[PDB]
Symmetry: D2
């Protein structure tokens, strides 16, 4: 399969977990991949492994909450490549705190900061590059963007906000030929609130979120925009 | 590129339009295809064109509202092939009638009968075959399953019913390894094929809101169906995927 | 409180359960109530109890799946009263069957027949009366109109269909001044578990009065800018 | 009608517009009302008009983006009253910017800051008082929390975030007897003047803008025992917009 053949793909949070798996899967589908993470060492380790397999890949440190660093990366991509075919906003954090605890404030600030504000930073900064290539954006949402589930308030809200960001980015960028979608994973390999309701009675394998991301990023989804696709084993239908 | 390699796919309403395109697209992805349509001659003409191109396909008449005929087809499939890998419930009709008109009743009965009751008939009858193969089901939902849009009451309700049917079939069939999903298209080009049936202004409800400002190509609805029916969707069930140019997000 | 002062309210399935409670609550809010049920003896018993309490009520047998009987009632209402201020489609049934069982077909036909086809029959037939009064409609949906929960396929589908019916009725009847809404209850005190209780935020079954109050609200001028809407009354179930 | 009889109700952004009208409508339903607004003179002016009509009300200046100011108010309410029966998070702002413009950043920050971060600030600070009274919360969401409509990105996102906040606050505060809900207005007469209207009007089935009192009534309903089995819920008050 070559669903992303010769496409330039940027994946944030690519040092481990789903982001690294999405980076590897995009390369397997023919993409050249830019892997970025707050842990630059991890991003470069993942990129060097792809390179060692004959893929075209590079890795860099990037804190998505640093608007100056995001702008620098955006200028760099535009200057070296002239555009960006796919942006995957995968960088995220979570936390543990009930709403009625003082701990909820610091957890809220941290999670909102990365999951929502960082996704806005990278999304807004990469618009010129996405315009030049008529690329598309895939956000990492969550089933927590539709129900509260068992995640902390900052996480639920950040993912509900990403759901809305998908819609309004799609609206504003559609005139420029840019599609914007999201996946909403349930629990993926990377607990009661999810297992009671997941129809498949199993957590997802990382490859099973990779394939829907690649689909949405590909011409198979060329009439799909503003859409959040559950990848959740039936969780939200239960 | 063979997402459905050697898989047996049954498509209803496959004699024309989107159903025929889903059938061809499945074959191009490696599937053996059973095409059925109320017009059996049309289903056979579509199947024969696939056979001439080297694919493996067959066509039959099927009235999805006839439970006896649906059961006969299911028994035939189980007996001849031992199972069914993909069911696509595409057969469907629409209509024009406002809720306050007497005409709304005949339209409602007809549309509910084909779109919802037919989809239930075919889905329920093929469960044994789907269990044997651990196959999956893709329903044809609609943007009208989420909002009223411009469609007649029977159509809106049939597609909202299909959305719920997706969820409860997914729940009850998950222990048998059967995924159940749906696509929710806006207007695609096959629905514009007959000119005299395109009333002036008739697509404004959709065109005024769709973000891409165009009717979808028929192949752009085929590809998401194939995706949902494939192992790329192996962790997706109970899910209804809009394929609508951004209509429902607007 | 007189949220439905002098309004005429028709409640289907009012012989017992939520329909009888909605009928009583509507009368308490000032309404004249027509109570109908396939069990006409129960409908008349509920109506006569309301009459004995000093309210204005009447009861009749009605099978909502019988289009001829539904039309006769709609004609009687238009002739005797000139219009209808509120229609509450509450009549409903349920059943038990998994989708892969042969029994699912009989359950499907029975449940679709009352819950969806019956609601269509009554809704469509009462449009002339609703237009004359600029009345409104409240359907009984369910949390099962949004997720599969633990209900049988025919029930789940019937309630998702009611959700859509709410939307397209609202669209077509808005130009005539008719609002159309629905409540989506969780599990209520009635003929009626873990699938719900593990998820309900309030960790209890709803009281019947707690579905009556939202129905009265939607039927009242408090909801004069609300149409096409389905209001969960579910202790938080759908938000969990 | 006394749906909120003797209940203490705090309304943010109550200096004008919907917040002022919710404050007045709550007082009409028997509530004692605390009105707060970044313009404290306006909040006190609205409170004094209610006091003149025989209701019990007070006004204060409050910037909902100032966490120390919010904490002081929460302390004052808890100390003086021992609890809070209703919190209405109404304070909000909007703005004009498309996502691909540089102006979208400053609009985003400003709108997120009031609409989402302020609603969080007030909601989290008032939890002790809400616990002591088993009060409830009504957020001001929007049809924009469900579809993109015509609003700027920061507004759409802030209201979808409010939608999710309703759900997770309801989950965490249900053990303490606190319901949390929201209304989702469409276009209402007020700052329908810095958006212009046709994105809402094309889809609004009633083909009219909602009157202010038609949003007040559903807010009062959700804040009252009529909604005692309703939590985590976002109620559209939109003329049919989201059903179209
Ligand atoms: N794993 C799941 O079950 C699941 C479910 C739903 C959604 N998601 C979403 O998938 C995405 C990835 O999840 P994961 O399980 O791989 O998480 P993970 O914590 O394993 O990986 C997150 C990655 O993002 C990076 N990161 C954190 N903060 C950053 C910042 N400021 N700038 C740049 N990079 C940063 C981390 O270094 C890490 O490499 C997240 O957005 C998460 O919310 C995951
Ligand atoms: N009780 C709950 O937990 C709950 C939850 C969600 C939704 N609902 C819905 O609320 C409505 C009332 O439920 P309930 O619990 O009071 O049920 P119930 O069975 O106690 O009452 C239903 C009433 O409808 C009548 N009825 C049945 N078939 C009829 C027909 N063909 N014509 C006329 N009347 C008929 C019955 O005789 C009965 O009086 C139903 O639509 C139900 O689906 C109930
Ligand atoms: N989305 C929609 O369709 C829609 C339409 C109208 C109103 N609304 C919502 O209703 C609410 C009220 O709207 P409105 O039309 O009355 O707005 P408005 O501009 O008329 O009034 C808003 C009030 O909030 C106050 N305020 C602003 N920033 C503040 C801060 N940092 N701290 C405290 N107070 C502050 C202002 O002083 C003002 O009095 C808002 O949340 C708004 O988003 C939504």
């Amino acid at each position: 399969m070559e669903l992303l053949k010769e496409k330039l793909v940027l994946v944030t949070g690519a040092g481990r977990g789903l982001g690294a798996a999405i980076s590897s899967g995009a390369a397997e589908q023919g993409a050249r991949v830019i892997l970025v993470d707050i842990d630059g060492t991890a991003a470069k380790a993942q990129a060097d492994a792809l390179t060692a397999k004959g893929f075209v890949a590079e890795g860099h440190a990037l804190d998505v909450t640093d608007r100056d660093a995001v702008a620098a990366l955006a200028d760099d991509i535009l200057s070296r490549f002239g555009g960006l075919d796919v942006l995957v906003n995968n960088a995220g954090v979570a936390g543990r705190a009930a709403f009625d605890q003082p701990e909820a404030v610091e957890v809220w600030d941290r999670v909102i900061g990365v999951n929502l504000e960082g996704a806005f930073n990278v999304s807004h900064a990469l618009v010129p590059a996405l315009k030049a290539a008529k690329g598309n954006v895939v956000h990492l949402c969550s089933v927590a963007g539709f129900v509260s589930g068992g995640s902390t308030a900052g996480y639920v809200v950040s993912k509900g906000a990403i759901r809305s960001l998908t819609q309004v980015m799609a609206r504003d960028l559609a005139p420029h030929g840019i599609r914007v979608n999201a996946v909403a994973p349930g629990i993926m390999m990377s607990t009661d609130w999810f297992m009671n309701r997941v129809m498949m009675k199993r957590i997802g394998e990382t490859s099973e979120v990779v394939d829907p991301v690649v689909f949405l990023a590909s011409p198979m989804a060329s009439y799909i925009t503003g859409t959040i696709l559950p990848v959740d084993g039936g969780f939200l239908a239960a």
